[PDB]
Swiss-Prot record:
The gene is Def1. It comes from the Eukaryota. Changing residue 33 to R: In strain: Gbjo3a. This is Defensin. Belongs to the invertebrate defensin family. Type 1 subfamily. The chain holds residues 63 to 102 of 102 of the full protein. Disulfide bonds join 3-30, 16-36, 20-38. Responsible for the anti Gram-positive activity of immune hemolymph. Induction: By bacterial infection. It is found in: Secreted.
């Protein structure tokens, strides 16, 4: 869920990043703490 990857399998939900985009943020990279630090 979210941007959790753990060992590895592919890409997470990416909802967090998209959510940021659909607001004002340019995007957001999913850091390895499922924080998905977005950026304007």
């Amino acid at each position: 869920a979210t941007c959790d990857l753990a060992s590895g399998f592919g890409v997470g939900s990416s909802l967090c990043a998209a959510h940021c985009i659909a607001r004002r943020y340019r995007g957001g990279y999913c850091n390895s703490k499922a924080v998905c630090v977005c950026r304007n």
